[PDB]
Protein backbone atom coordinates (compact mmCIF):
# COMPACT_ATOMS: atom_id res chain seq x y z
CA UNK A 1 0.00 0.00 0.00
CA UNK A 2 1.31 3.54 -0.64
CA UNK A 3 1.59 5.66 2.49
CA UNK A 4 1.88 9.42 2.80
CA UNK A 5 2.99 10.96 6.07
CA UNK A 6 2.02 14.30 7.50
CA UNK A 7 4.51 15.37 10.18
CA UNK A 8 2.67 17.40 12.83
CA UNK A 9 5.72 18.36 14.91
CA UNK A 10 6.01 22.08 14.03
CA UNK A 11 4.73 21.84 10.45
CA UNK A 12 4.83 24.61 7.87
CA UNK A 13 2.09 25.72 5.47
CA UNK A 14 4.32 24.69 2.53
CA UNK A 15 4.69 21.18 3.97
CA UNK A 16 0.90 20.83 4.42
CA UNK A 17 0.30 22.00 0.79
CA UNK A 18 2.88 19.53 -0.50
CA UNK A 19 1.13 16.77 1.52
CA UNK A 20 -2.22 17.67 -0.08
CA UNK A 21 -0.62 17.60 -3.53
CA UNK A 22 0.83 14.15 -2.88
CA UNK A 23 -2.71 12.87 -2.25
CA UNK A 24 -3.96 14.45 -5.47
CA UNK A 25 -0.92 13.23 -7.41
CA UNK A 26 -1.41 9.66 -6.16
CA UNK A 27 -5.07 9.22 -7.28
CA UNK A 28 -5.33 11.37 -10.37
CA UNK A 29 -5.12 10.18 -13.95
CA UNK A 30 -3.16 12.94 -15.74
CA UNK A 31 -4.72 11.89 -19.09
CA UNK A 32 -8.27 12.87 -18.19
CA UNK A 33 -9.76 16.33 -18.43
CA UNK A 34 -13.39 17.34 -18.23
CA UNK A 35 -15.34 20.38 -19.43
CA UNK A 36 -12.27 21.88 -21.09
CA UNK A 37 -10.65 22.58 -17.70
CA UNK A 38 -7.31 21.49 -16.26
CA UNK A 39 -8.68 20.33 -12.88
CA UNK A 40 -7.18 16.96 -11.84
CA UNK A 41 -9.55 13.97 -12.18
CA UNK A 42 -9.37 10.80 -10.04
CA UNK A 43 -8.46 7.78 -12.21
CA UNK A 44 -10.43 4.58 -12.73
CA UNK A 45 -10.58 1.82 -10.11
CA UNK A 46 -7.61 -0.55 -9.94
CA UNK A 47 -6.24 -3.33 -7.77
CA UNK A 48 -4.39 -0.77 -5.60
CA UNK A 49 -7.59 0.04 -3.77
CA UNK A 50 -6.35 1.89 -0.68
CA UNK A 51 -4.09 4.78 0.34
CA UNK A 52 -2.55 5.01 3.83
CA UNK A 53 -2.16 8.39 5.52
CA UNK A 54 0.04 8.62 8.61
CA UNK A 55 -0.30 11.50 11.09
CA UNK A 56 2.93 11.71 13.09
CA UNK A 57 3.27 13.64 16.35
CA UNK A 58 6.13 13.48 18.89
CA UNK A 59 4.00 10.95 20.89
CA UNK A 60 3.26 8.41 18.14
CA UNK A 61 1.45 7.88 14.84
CA UNK A 62 -2.26 7.47 14.05
CA UNK A 63 -3.08 6.30 10.50
CA UNK A 64 -6.12 6.72 8.27
CA UNK A 65 -7.11 4.62 5.24
CA UNK A 66 -8.83 6.21 2.20
CA UNK A 67 -10.17 4.57 -0.90
CA UNK A 68 -8.15 5.53 -4.02
CA UNK A 69 -11.14 5.42 -6.40
CA UNK A 70 -13.17 8.08 -4.58
CA UNK A 71 -11.27 9.23 -1.44
CA UNK A 72 -13.90 7.85 0.94
CA UNK A 73 -12.71 7.00 4.46
CA UNK A 74 -12.27 3.28 5.19
CA UNK A 75 -10.60 2.79 8.59
CA UNK A 76 -8.14 4.16 11.15
CA UNK A 77 -5.29 2.62 13.16
CA UNK A 78 -4.26 3.75 16.65
CA UNK A 79 -2.52 2.24 19.66
CA UNK A 80 -4.69 1.95 22.77
CA UNK A 81 -3.59 2.67 26.36
CA UNK A 82 -1.69 -0.64 26.62
CA UNK A 83 0.24 0.13 23.43
CA UNK A 84 -1.60 -2.43 21.33
CA UNK A 85 -2.21 -1.50 17.66
CA UNK A 86 -5.96 -1.59 16.90
CA UNK A 87 -7.63 -1.06 13.54
CA UNK A 88 -11.20 0.25 13.29
CA UNK A 89 -13.11 -0.05 10.05
CA UNK A 90 -16.22 0.72 8.10
CA UNK A 91 -17.57 -2.58 6.76
CA UNK A 92 -19.12 -1.06 3.64
CA UNK A 93 -15.69 0.23 2.54
CA UNK A 94 -13.28 -2.59 3.40
CA UNK A 95 -13.22 -6.20 4.62
CA UNK A 96 -11.23 -7.66 7.53
CA UNK A 97 -9.10 -9.51 4.94
CA UNK A 98 -8.07 -6.39 2.99
CA UNK A 99 -7.57 -4.48 6.26
CA UNK A 100 -4.64 -6.77 7.09
CA UNK A 101 -2.87 -5.51 3.92
CA UNK A 102 -3.67 -1.86 4.69
CA UNK A 103 -2.61 -2.05 8.37
CA UNK A 104 -0.32 -5.11 8.70
CA UNK A 105 0.49 -3.99 12.24
CA UNK A 106 -2.98 -4.99 13.50
CA UNK A 107 -3.81 -8.71 13.81
CA UNK A 108 -7.29 -10.07 13.08
CA UNK A 109 -8.52 -10.12 16.66
CA UNK A 110 -7.28 -6.49 17.06
CA UNK A 111 -9.56 -5.30 14.23
CA UNK A 112 -12.96 -3.84 15.22
CA UNK A 113 -15.86 -3.15 12.85
CA UNK A 114 -17.29 0.30 13.65
CA UNK A 115 -20.88 0.33 14.86
CA UNK A 116 -21.88 3.44 12.85
CA UNK A 117 -21.74 4.32 9.13
CA UNK A 118 -19.26 6.57 7.34
CA UNK A 119 -21.74 9.26 6.20
CA UNK A 120 -21.14 12.56 7.98
CA UNK A 121 -24.57 12.55 9.68
CA UNK A 122 -23.85 9.25 11.46
CA UNK A 123 -20.31 10.16 12.50
CA UNK A 124 -21.63 13.53 13.73
CA UNK A 125 -24.32 11.83 15.81
CA UNK A 126 -21.52 9.75 17.39
CA UNK A 127 -19.40 12.87 18.03
CA UNK A 128 -22.15 14.30 20.32
CA UNK A 129 -21.92 17.94 19.22
CA UNK A 130 -24.22 20.00 21.43
CA UNK A 131 -23.62 23.49 20.05
CA UNK A 132 -25.24 25.28 17.15
CA UNK A 133 -26.50 23.13 14.29
CA UNK A 134 -24.97 19.98 15.86
CA UNK A 135 -22.87 19.23 12.75
CA UNK A 136 -19.10 19.12 12.08
CA UNK A 137 -19.31 22.73 11.14
CA UNK A 138 -19.36 23.70 14.82
CA UNK A 139 -16.01 21.94 15.55
CA UNK A 140 -13.95 24.18 13.24
CA UNK A 141 -10.92 23.13 11.18
CA UNK A 142 -7.14 23.74 11.40
CA UNK A 143 -3.83 22.01 12.02
CA UNK A 144 -3.86 22.60 15.78
CA UNK A 145 -7.36 21.09 16.00
CA UNK A 146 -6.23 17.96 14.02
CA UNK A 147 -3.29 17.58 16.42
CA UNK A 148 -5.44 17.84 19.56
CA UNK A 149 -8.05 15.37 18.30
CA UNK A 150 -5.33 12.99 17.06
CA UNK A 151 -3.72 13.08 20.50
CA UNK A 152 -7.02 12.21 22.16
CA UNK A 153 -6.95 8.82 20.34
CA UNK A 154 -3.18 8.17 20.27
CA UNK A 155 -2.32 5.59 22.97
CA UNK A 156 -5.60 6.13 24.78
CA UNK A 157 -8.58 3.95 25.57
CA UNK A 158 -11.18 4.13 22.80
CA UNK A 159 -13.94 6.68 23.49
CA UNK A 160 -16.56 6.96 20.76
CA UNK A 161 -16.91 10.75 21.07
CA UNK A 162 -13.13 11.33 20.73
CA UNK A 163 -12.91 8.85 17.86
CA UNK A 164 -15.80 10.36 15.94
CA UNK A 165 -14.45 13.87 16.46
CA UNK A 166 -11.04 12.74 15.24
CA UNK A 167 -12.59 11.20 12.11
CA UNK A 168 -14.61 14.33 11.28
CA UNK A 169 -11.47 16.48 11.35
CA UNK A 170 -9.10 13.97 9.77
CA UNK A 171 -11.38 13.30 6.80
CA UNK A 172 -11.89 17.04 6.10
CA UNK A 173 -8.17 17.77 6.47
CA UNK A 174 -7.16 15.09 3.92
CA UNK A 175 -9.87 14.10 1.43
CA UNK A 176 -11.99 17.30 1.44
CA UNK A 177 -8.98 19.62 1.18
CA UNK A 178 -7.70 17.45 -1.71
CA UNK A 179 -11.05 17.91 -3.49
CA UNK A 180 -11.63 21.58 -2.68
CA UNK A 181 -8.99 24.31 -2.84
CA UNK A 182 -11.33 26.73 -1.06
CA UNK A 183 -10.94 24.58 2.09
CA UNK A 184 -7.21 24.08 1.58
CA UNK A 185 -6.76 27.89 1.31
CA UNK A 186 -8.68 28.40 4.55
CA UNK A 187 -6.28 26.06 6.40
CA UNK A 188 -3.27 27.86 4.80
CA UNK A 189 -4.48 31.42 5.48
CA UNK A 190 -4.98 30.56 9.18
CA UNK A 191 -1.94 28.29 9.55
CA UNK A 192 -1.54 26.54 12.00
CA UNK A 193 -4.44 27.71 14.11
CA UNK A 194 -7.90 26.33 14.72
CA UNK A 195 -10.49 28.49 12.86
CA UNK A 196 -14.24 28.52 12.28
CA UNK A 197 -15.71 26.51 9.43
CA UNK A 198 -18.57 28.17 7.43
CA UNK A 199 -21.55 27.09 5.31
CA UNK A 200 -19.48 27.31 2.14
CA UNK A 201 -17.22 24.51 3.40
CA UNK A 202 -20.25 22.30 4.12
CA UNK A 203 -21.86 23.21 0.76
CA UNK A 204 -18.76 22.22 -1.20
CA UNK A 205 -18.51 18.91 0.73
CA UNK A 206 -22.06 17.80 -0.07
CA UNK A 207 -21.82 18.87 -3.73
CA UNK A 208 -18.71 17.06 -4.97
CA UNK A 209 -20.75 14.82 -7.21
CA UNK A 210 -23.09 17.53 -8.56
CA UNK A 211 -20.06 19.72 -9.27
CA UNK A 212 -18.15 16.97 -11.04
CA UNK A 213 -21.06 15.87 -13.23
CA UNK A 214 -21.94 19.46 -14.18
CA UNK A 215 -18.34 20.15 -15.33
CA UNK A 216 -18.22 16.87 -17.18
CA UNK A 217 -21.58 17.23 -18.96
CA UNK A 218 -22.75 20.86 -18.84
CA UNK A 219 -19.55 22.88 -19.25
CA UNK A 220 -17.59 23.94 -22.35
CA UNK A 221 -14.16 25.56 -22.16
CA UNK A 222 -14.58 26.10 -18.39
CA UNK A 223 -17.99 27.78 -18.56
CA UNK A 224 -21.26 26.20 -17.52
CA UNK A 225 -24.08 26.25 -20.11
CA UNK A 226 -26.35 27.81 -17.43
CA UNK A 227 -26.09 29.14 -13.88
CA UNK A 228 -25.44 26.66 -11.07
CA UNK A 229 -26.00 27.33 -7.36
CA UNK A 230 -24.49 25.12 -4.64
CA UNK A 231 -25.65 27.50 -1.93
CA UNK A 232 -22.98 30.25 -2.03
CA UNK A 233 -24.24 32.21 -5.05
CA UNK A 234 -24.88 31.69 -8.74
CA UNK A 235 -21.86 30.46 -10.65
CA UNK A 236 -21.14 30.32 -14.40
CA UNK A 237 -17.30 30.13 -14.48
CA UNK A 238 -15.92 26.75 -13.31
CA UNK A 239 -12.87 28.57 -11.90
CA UNK A 240 -15.01 30.22 -9.17
CA UNK A 241 -15.37 26.73 -7.60
CA UNK A 242 -11.58 26.46 -6.99
CA UNK A 243 -11.70 22.70 -7.50
CA UNK A 244 -8.73 20.47 -6.60
CA UNK A 245 -10.02 17.07 -7.79
CA UNK A 246 -13.04 15.81 -9.66
CA UNK A 247 -14.75 12.46 -9.33
CA UNK A 248 -13.95 9.85 -11.98
CA UNK A 249 -16.79 9.72 -14.52
CA UNK A 250 -15.06 7.76 -17.30
CA UNK A 251 -13.76 9.10 -20.61
CA UNK A 252 -14.42 12.73 -21.41
CA UNK A 253 -17.33 13.61 -23.68
d(CA 148, CA 102): 25
Which residues lie below 8 Å from residue 53, measured CB to CB, with a gap of 6+?
A: 3, 4, 5, 6, 23, 63, 64, 65, 66, 170, 174
Nearest to 123 by CA among 58, 77, 73: 73
- Residue 63: what are its φ and ψ, rounded to 5°? -115, 150
CB atoms within 10 A of CB 213: 14
Q: Which helix (H) or strand (E) holds 25?
A: helix 13-27
Residues forming the active site: 176
Instruction: Render the burial of 60-78: b for 16+ CB within 10 Å, e for the rest.
Output: ebbbbbbbbbebbbbbbbb
CA atoms within 13 A on the CB side of 252: 19
Fold of 179-250: Ricin (A Subunit), domain 2 (4.10.470)
Task: Tell me which method was used to determine the 3D structure.
Answer: X-ray
d(CA 144, CA 158): 21
Quickly count helices (H) and strands (E) in the chain: 9, 11
d(CA 110, CA 137): 32
Q: Where are the domains of the chain?
A: 1-178, 179-250
Nearest to 153 by CA among 90, 91, 65, 63: 63
Q: Which helix (H) or strand (E) holds 64?
A: strand 60-67
My answer on whether omega of the bond before 92 falls inside 30° of 0, hence cis, is no
Edge-first strand order for the sheet with 73-79 is 2-7, 50-57, 60-67, 73-79, 85-89, 111-113
Q: What share of the chain is helix, strand, coil (3-state, %, to 5)?
A: 40, 25, 40
CATH of 1-178, one of 3.60.40.10, 3.10.100.10, 1.10.287.540, 3.40.420.10: 3.40.420.10
3-state secondary structure of 161: helix
* Resolution to one decimal, Å: 2.0
Amino acid sequence: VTSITLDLVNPTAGQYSSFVDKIRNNVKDPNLKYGGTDIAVIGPPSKEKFLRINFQSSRGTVSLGLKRDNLYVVAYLAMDNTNVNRAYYFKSEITSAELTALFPEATTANQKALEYTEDYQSIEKNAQITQGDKSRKELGLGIDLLLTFMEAVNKKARVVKNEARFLLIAIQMTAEVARFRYIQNLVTKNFPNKFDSDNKVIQFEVSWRKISTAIYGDAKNGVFNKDYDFGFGKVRQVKDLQMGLLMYLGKPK
